[PDB]
Every structure is written in C-alpha cells, then in structure tokens.
Design a protein around this ligand. Sequence first.
Ligand SMILES: Nc1ncnc2c1ncn2[C@@H]1O[C@H](COP(=O)(O)OP(=O)(O)OP(=O)(O)OP(=O)(O)OP(=O)(O)OC[C@H]2O[C@@H](n3cnc4c(N)ncnc43)[C@H](O)[C@@H]2O)[C@@H](O)[C@H]1O
Length: 214
Amino acid sequence: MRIILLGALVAGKGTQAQFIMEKYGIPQISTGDMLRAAVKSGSELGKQAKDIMDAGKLVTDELVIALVKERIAQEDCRNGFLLDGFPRTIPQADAMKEAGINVDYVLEFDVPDELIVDRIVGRRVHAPSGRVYHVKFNPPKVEGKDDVTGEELTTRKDDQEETVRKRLVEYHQMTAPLIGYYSKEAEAGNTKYAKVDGTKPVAEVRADLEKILG
Ligand SMILES: Nc1ncnc2c1ncn2[C@@H]1O[C@H](COP(=O)(O)OP(=O)(O)OP(=O)(O)OP(=O)(O)OP(=O)(O)OC[C@H]2O[C@@H](n3cnc4c(N)ncnc43)[C@H](O)[C@@H]2O)[C@@H](O)[C@H]1O
C-alpha cells in the first residue's frame, strides 16, 4: 500500500509512521531520518545536508528526490511504503507525479500553531534508532533513557527554538501548498485524503488511523 503523511511541524507524523509500518507491514521512508543518518556516518550527502538542516533551511530538491528514488527502488518498498517527510515542496510532489508514483492515502496531521514550538522543543530522540519521545507529552519510562536499548536520548540542533521558528516560515512557504496539492488529486480520483487531529492522545490518533486504513 502507499501512503503520504503530510502535516504541520511536530503534529505527530513520525510517531505514527511506526504503527502504520508494523500494522500494515510497509517501509517507513523518513527523509528526515535518512539525511540525519547520512550526517552521522560522514557520507557525502551528510556533508551537504548538515549545515542546511541545522539552519532550518530545507535541503535541495534535486538531492532529496535522488535519495528517495534510490530507496523506493529497493526490494522492500516492493509492496508499498509510507513516505514520512517526502514531499516537502510542490517540486518534490510533481517529480513523484511525473515519475508515475500514485499513492493510495494521504493523511494530514493537523495541530493548531500554538502547539508547534512546544511539540518540537521538548522532543528528545534516541539517536541510533530514531525513536522519538516528548519530555512532557510522550515521555520515556526512565527519564533520559530510551525504553528499548537503555541508551540516553538526545536533542536535535534543529529542535532548538529559534531554528523551529525559521522552519515554520520555510514550511508556510514551501510545504503548506501540498495540502492543496494532494486535495486536488484526491478530487481528481487519484488518492484518498483524510485529515487527523494531531492534538489527541497518541492512543486515539492511532485508533483514528486504523479506522481509516483498516
Ligand atoms: N523532503 C525533504 N526535503 C528537504 N529537506 C528535507 C526533507 N525532509 C527532511 N528534510 C530536512 O531535514 C530537516 C527535518 O525534517 P524532518 O526530520 O522530516 O522533520 P521533523 O523535524 O521530524 O518534524 P515533523 O514536523 O515532520 O514532525 P512529526 O509530525 O513527525 O511529529 P513528531 O512525531 O516528531 O512529534 C513531535 C513531538 O511531539 C510528540 N507527539 C506526537 N503525538 C503527540 C500527541 N498527540 N500528544 C503529545 N505529544 C505528541 C512526539 O513524541 C515528539 O515529542 C528539515 O529541517 C529539512 O532540512
């Protein structure tokens, strides 16, 4: 099955990408996690991306479409995938359309703008695994420690408050047009569109999503 998770910053996309990944058995394709992984392995892409990432600027289209075509192309995206963080600009969305990749579901996670800087700045990451926690809203069972490996959680440099603010502008300009995009397509017959309330309990939203997919 193929699904795009679209949404505002911090709305909870990635926290759900996990669930959809097991339940419906498909690769989670996180451009965030992959650029961050390229960075912590000193791969060539990891030299381009880090300063941009860090800066709140979006990485280059020409580059991220390249990353993501390589990945869909691997034998596990064979029966579907869920894109988490691709597309982030109408450029990325048209390139996927031009390539002939039509997806089944587009799910929009909404959160009211007041929540966005709180969502991001209290967010701790168990770096190796990409396991995402919120200090206040979805905490580890042992503070500071990750629930599975016992290893300390960290904070991203782009989850630093004034970078969160630079991201929100870039978002509004860049990525906000894709809701319109995917709604015209769902109108054209091309996908299904649903919107989910990113403020409910991680629990409830999980349910809201089963009730959509199956
Ligand atoms: N395609 C692309 N093109 C170019 N550059 C690209 C790109 N893709 C990536 N990049 C780049 O790399 C950088 C980062 O991109 P990326 O890494 O993809 O973005 P992100 O920082 O993970 O932010 P999102 O807004 O997508 O968060 P989310 O909705 O998944 O919510 P989350 O689960 O984290 O949740 C957030 C927090 O709140 C939590 N939470 C979730 N649900 C609830 C709830 N209901 N109640 C309370 N807390 C909750 C979480 O536990 C956590 O604490 C960019 O700056 C850009 O440079």
